[PDB]
Symmetry: C2
Amino acid sequence: MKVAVLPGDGIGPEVTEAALKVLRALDEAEGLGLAYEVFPFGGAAIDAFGEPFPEPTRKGVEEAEAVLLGSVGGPKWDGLPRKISPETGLLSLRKSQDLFANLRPAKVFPGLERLSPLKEEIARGVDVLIVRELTGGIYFGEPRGMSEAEAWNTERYSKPEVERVARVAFEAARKRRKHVVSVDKANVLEVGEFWRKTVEEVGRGYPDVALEHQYVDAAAMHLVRSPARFDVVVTGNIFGDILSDLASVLPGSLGLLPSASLGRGTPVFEPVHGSAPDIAGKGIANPTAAILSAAMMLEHAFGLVELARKVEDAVAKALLETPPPDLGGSAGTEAFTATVLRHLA
Amino acid sequence: MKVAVLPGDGIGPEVTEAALKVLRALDEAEGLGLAYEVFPFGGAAIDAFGEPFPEPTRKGVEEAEAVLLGSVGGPKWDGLPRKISPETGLLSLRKSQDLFANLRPAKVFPGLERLSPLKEEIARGVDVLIVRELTGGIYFGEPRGMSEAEAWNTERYSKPEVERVARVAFEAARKRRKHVVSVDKANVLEVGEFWRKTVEEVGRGYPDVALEHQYVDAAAMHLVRSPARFDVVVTGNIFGDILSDLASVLPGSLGLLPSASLGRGTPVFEPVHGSAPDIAGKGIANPTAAILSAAMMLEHAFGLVELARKVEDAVAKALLETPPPDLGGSAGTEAFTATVLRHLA
């Protein structure tokens, strides 16, 4: 179990160690053979090395089995040419490992239904994993242009693009509740038709997973009316962007959300929140998203599903008994982490 | 005030007269000079004439100033070649009048916050009008195709297309709270950039209306977290499809929703619900969407904003004191209508 740790900026060093504290505790209890090294990345690497993703770090993620990544960026580096912005270092990283699926889960932890914008009865039991295609579709499609008179962009998908990301959805589903909803616009668009027939054909190799197709306008409505009905959702790039963002508001606190990216190379697991530099070093940063990034790593990078679930329960419980300040509580980074470990035992 | 009335199918005859009863009452009180005629349309016209939009009806909407339309279709006609399906008659109608904007309002009536999927505090005061471009964008754009290997569709907009639908949003806003949010994907797409700069330029002729730009992924999130913040939203075809459908679940009852379509020709105002043929002639159909279609006609077809608002309040009140069966009540079509008229006085 070889993990490259890229702490990043702002609160990154704090919350990433909070996750390492949890990974070490499991390493000890279960003998996971955890071996990790920490590399420079983001703003700190610019300051130290002159660039956000220096060669030792690139080398280090190349050799690792998973990357645990803290937060990156901050006003400190907003004034840079974007060949060396923190943002661009993030892109090279995911590009260097050819990560073509983005995994974004939204989950209303029991007893935290009050945070939801949804009525308590609808928020309860929500646990949806959106699988977003990352590399293709309209964000990248040609031809594209703009005129005095008109502009155009092309939503375009090749079979292989549709095939990869569908395979990761089915394998993810295998680890959860084995239901996949593929989302398209097959009733109006060729691309929708092509996506659907392709995912239907891919699904034949996964007899143990249930497959269902929905239109993007309908899935949008289901995510507000009955979001507890979903397990894994897979869709193209722009749809998956909208539906990820829509699903992310359901729990009522963005600081709680982890994120993974999978592909041919070394997978990247990171919290969705930012650096929050203002509080860097105060010891109050909520480590929840980082710890749940580590659980995502166990599940998706190493297949240790039962441990990922053990970690997720420890934080569900910790969130109730020692809520961090941004859930109205007074638990600093360390006190919260300690509560998690208590339940890990 | 010359209205062509196209009752349609199923519950269409019932709910459309419930709206006419309300229009007559106002005609009497205010001397509006209401003159209307009822034309065959939809399944009934197929049965009577052999087609859904026969020539007397086409003639009749041509000469009118607004079309008040009931529901169309039903299993009775599901087995038809779609050159004469009810659905297609609907298309010819909107095509024959060149209606290029779809207006879909979502509104949580005071005291009906309990129906919302949203927490009561978030649902309260929601009143958003989505203005959807109807004729353009990816649903219609070329080139488009599909291969063994790939499929493609083109999101394409000309300046004039962006200009019309923006003008109707600004004029709609003028009648409401004078805030327009244009929704694009300007941070990734040319088409987003082009839409945005065009709407910004159109907005200069409407100094009295406030304009704000949002991305589609963000507007999606705002519609769940803070939907009471919106007044008028204008966006392209596929986005407006998603955001219309998303906004439509906010009130918690689809049977309540009206719809208008505006263009160069005679405007069409219709309930969003279907024929519900099973209950046709029982006298229990909820006329709310039809009556609120008539209020939409007053506002958008004739500019009678204060009357539209008077009608909307009468039904807000009627919904509380004599709820129709589908709001848990026992009010049939006539009893509900009567309650509306009581408050119209």
